Design a protein around this ligand. Structure first.
Ligand SMILES: Cc1cc2nc3c(=O)[nH]c(=O)nc-3n(C[C@H](O)[C@H](O)[C@H](O)COP(=O)(O)OP(=O)(O)OC[C@H]3O[C@@H](n4cnc5c(N)ncnc54)[C@H](O)[C@@H]3O)c2cc1C
Ligand SMILES: CC1(C)c2[nH]c3cc(Cl)ccc3c2C[C@@]23CN4CCC[C@]4(C[C@@H]12)C(=O)N3
Ligand SMILES: CC1(C)c2[nH]c3cc(Cl)ccc3c2C[C@@]23CN4CCC[C@]4(C[C@@H]12)C(=O)N3
Ligand SMILES: [Cl-]
Ligand SMILES: [Zn+2]
Length: 664
């Protein structure tokens, strides 16, 4: 495809604002429609996943308008994504060659557990992702993922309006498929709001819960909650002085300790780029995806930035997520002038390993505009007690949220967004095909499972969060109990069989494994023990021994009962094939390498000879995947064969679940 500069030129010819150039790409036009089947409040990632999935699940059935108050896709925290999300992107026709032009490669999770009383001691738990011919995960800058999904939405019959605000004071939402009247303005100062007559309203306003807060108070779980404070840093090409052995920047890295943990996410940033030029670059990428342009013949990230007049740089997202029963000194002014900055820098010098780690990084000022050098968010976890009602439902963060840890926000959260999307077709047709009272009853009954799923979902994720946090108080429980169990219970068995049709059904059965009975049993034993030890004390060694022996006893039976074949010892660096911990073991598969020119992490596969980020020809990517223990040529062929194309939908085949086989 020859690149087009359609939006760049249109923006300049008409002197168009950011919201105007974006809204000019809408199928129905740059102004709001008088009527729609669905109106979605919010074009964060979940409002857009919802709109894309509803449209793709049954095209040309629902008219969908997404209303977003930001003038262009806005900054959001929440950058790490997981195989289920990549698979969703691939099912929606965007595979890794194209996604890697926009986003950072993620190919593993790694955990380093710092001993608080023996400064400088640590242990680790490391998993790899998958070969490049199998799948990828992604580290995403959220202004770019929300732009990608906006453009993709507009190319699939969905209208997305930036610069517009749902007015929840004058909006009317009513049941029975009768009629919503969604008031949309440019903000509070605007006294010519427009109304969209519509059948279904979707609350995708995230943690602000702008509609469902009207139906129930925010719910908080018992016990401590968490706070987060974070910033953006350079991303060193040379990672070798990082003080953790075998550290890799293409993992989501977790530095874990009694008070909480630090995330470390390497990702490219497009900040400073004009919105119109970005629309042209994204549109080009999608035309290239449509045409099947091979990776090596697709321009690199840096070449796209030259072609479309963009700004591109590598950054590291680094943040604390710590318990809110931490005691701070009253005066933290030695550490900075803002609270977020003060608590971040204070926590870094509490651990010699965090200070040594951070000394590989340089703070970026105001990456996302003035005031954004530092971020702080307090009291993270909450649940919405009501997530649907006559004329509406809620998805994503508007249902509830727990913690950054294991990235449930996007990757588990998209189970609500994609199930709501699928359900939206019969909800709208019911209202068009039955009188009001029966329509409303039928819709209510259809949504009982969705309501029930959301109700038990956040408590399960909250118990998952606490399980990990308490085990992070010790350098044996963290890796050998909490990480082991999250990986065993939550690995996505039979993900290669998922298709658009089964996606929501599969996703709601996953829950990161947090509903697996043996997982809950080990989690409750640890939480019950550890929560009785004040935060400022070390766990008694006998308590660690007892909890470790318990975990291992439950684990060995649950692993024996699982029927899913997996080369556990190639994925986890420190465990054998039966998921037993091995004190010295370092061996495992190698799926990635760093470009020697630009530092970007790359997937090893023989059809990608050039770095996808800077274009430098891998000297001769003789560097092939290393399987340890080895695979034959046939076994390798078989592996890649399973992941080529998702199977067609078979309404008679039953869905194989992601979770371990039950013991019978
Ligand atoms: C510190 C931290 C780290 C995290 N890390 C991760 C991670 O690594 N991975 C992960 O998966 N998750 C992570 N999360 C969770 C993640 O940030 C959220 O789950 C996710 O961004 C929520 O998406 P959403 O679409 O529901 O809401 P949002 O992305 O918050 O979007 C809601 C949208 O609604 C809009 N809106 C609000 N009011 C109106 C109105 N009246 N009219 C129109 N529009 C409106 C807002 O402008 C906004 O764009 C993290 C969360 C925190 C706090
Ligand atoms: C199931 C997947 C998505 C997965 N899910 C994880 C969760 C955690 Cl917590 C850690 C690691 C993984 C992995 C690594 C896997 C293991 N599979 C072996 C055959 C194909 C595949 C898919 C992939 C692979 O190549 N790597
Ligand atoms: C298993 C069932 C009850 C189910 N349970 C769900 C839970 C969620 Cl969260 C979403 C969708 C479903 C479905 C739809 C299914 C899928 N099955 C395919 C073969 C037979 C069957 C039974 C039925 C079918 O025809 N429709
Ligand atoms: Cl993660
Ligand atoms: Zn490069």
């Amino acid at each position: 495809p020859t690149p087009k500069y359609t939006f760049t030129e249109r923006a300049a010819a008409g002197n168009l604002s950011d919201a105007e150039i974006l809204n000019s790409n809408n199928p129905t036009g740059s102004e709001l429609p008088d009527e729609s089947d669905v109106v979605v409040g919010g074009a964060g990632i979940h409002g857009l996943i919802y709109a894309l999935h509803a449209s793709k699940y049954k095209p040309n059935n629902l008219k969908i308008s997404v209303i977003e108050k930001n003038t262009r896709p806005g900054y959001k925290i929440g950058e790490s994504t997981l195989p289920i999300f990549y698979t969703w992107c691939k099912l929606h026709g965007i595979s890794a060659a194209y996604l890697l032009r926009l986003f950072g490669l993620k190919d593993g999770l790694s955990f380093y557990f710092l001993d608080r009383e023996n400064q400088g001691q640590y242990t680790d738990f490391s998993s790899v992702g998958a070969p490049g011919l199998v799948l990828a995960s992604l580290q995403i800058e959220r202004p770019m993922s929300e732009l990608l999904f906006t453009i993709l939405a507009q190319r699939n019959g969905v209208n997305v309006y930036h610069g517009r605000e749902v007015d929840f004071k004058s909006t009317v939402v009513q049941g029975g498929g009768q009629g919503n009247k969604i008031a949309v303005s440019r903000g509070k100062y605007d006294s010519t709001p427009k109304t969209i007559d519509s059948a279904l309203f979707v609350d995708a306003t995230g943690r602000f819960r702008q509609f469902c807060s009207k139906k129930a108070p925010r719910h908080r779980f018992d016990g401590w909650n968490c706070n987060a404070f974070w910033g953006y840093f350079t991303a060193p090409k040379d990672e070798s002085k990082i003080p953790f052995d075998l550290y890799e920047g293409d993992h989501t890295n977790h530095l874990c300790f009694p008070e909480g943990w630090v995330w470390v996410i390497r990702l490219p940033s497009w900040e400073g780029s004009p919105i119109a030029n970005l629309m042209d670059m994204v549109t080009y990428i999608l035309e290239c995806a449509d045409a099947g342009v091979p990776g090596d013949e697709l321009p690199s990230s840096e070449e796209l930035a030259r072609m479309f007049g963009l700004k591109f740089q590598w950054v590291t997202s680094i943040g604390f997520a710590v318990r809110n029963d931490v005691k701070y000194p009253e005066d933290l002014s030695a550490y900075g002038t803002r609270e977020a900055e003060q608590k971040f820098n204070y926590f870094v010098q509490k651990y010699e390993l965090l200070q040594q780690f951070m000394s590989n990084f340089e703070l970026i000022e105001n990456l996302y505009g003035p005031g954004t050098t530092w971020f702080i968010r307090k009291t993270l976890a909450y649940q919405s007690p009501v997530v649907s009602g006559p004329g509406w439902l809620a998805i994503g963060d508007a249902c509830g949220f727990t913690n950054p840890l294991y990235s449930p926000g996007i990757n588990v959260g998209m189970s609500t967004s994609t199930w709501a999307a699928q359900l939206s077709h019969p909800i709208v047709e019911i209202g068009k095909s039955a009188p009001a009272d029966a329509a409303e009853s039928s819709i209510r009954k259809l949504l009982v499972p969705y309501d029930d799923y959301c109700k038990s979902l956040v408590p399960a994720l909250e118990q998952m969060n606490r399980f990990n946090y308490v085990c992070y108080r010790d350098t044996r429980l963290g890796p050998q109990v909490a990480c082991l169990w999250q990986f065993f219970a939550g690995i996505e068995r039979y993900l290669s069989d998922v298709n658009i049709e089964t996606f929501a059904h599969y996703a709601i059965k996953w829950v990161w494994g947090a509903m697996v009975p043996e997982y809950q049993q080990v989690a409750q034993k640890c939480i019950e023990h550890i929560e009785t030890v004040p935060l400022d004390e070390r766990l008694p060694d006998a308590m660690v021994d007892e909890l470790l022996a318990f975990s291992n006893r439950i684990k060995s039976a649950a692993v024996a009962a699982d029927d899913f074949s997996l080369r556990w010892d190639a994925i986890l660096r420190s465990f054998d094939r039966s998921l037993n911990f091995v004190e010295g073991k370092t061996s495992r598969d190698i799926y990635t390498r760093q470009c020697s020119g630009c530092g970007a992490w790359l997937q090893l596969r023989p059809d990608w000879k050039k770095c996808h980020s800077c274009g430098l020809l891998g000297t001769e990517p003789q560097t092939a995947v290393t399987f340890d223990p080895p695979l034959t040529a046939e076994e390798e062929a078989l592996l890649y064969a399973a992941w080529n194309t998702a199977p067609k939908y078979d309404p008679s085949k039953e869905l194989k679940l992601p979770t371990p086989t039950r013991p019978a």
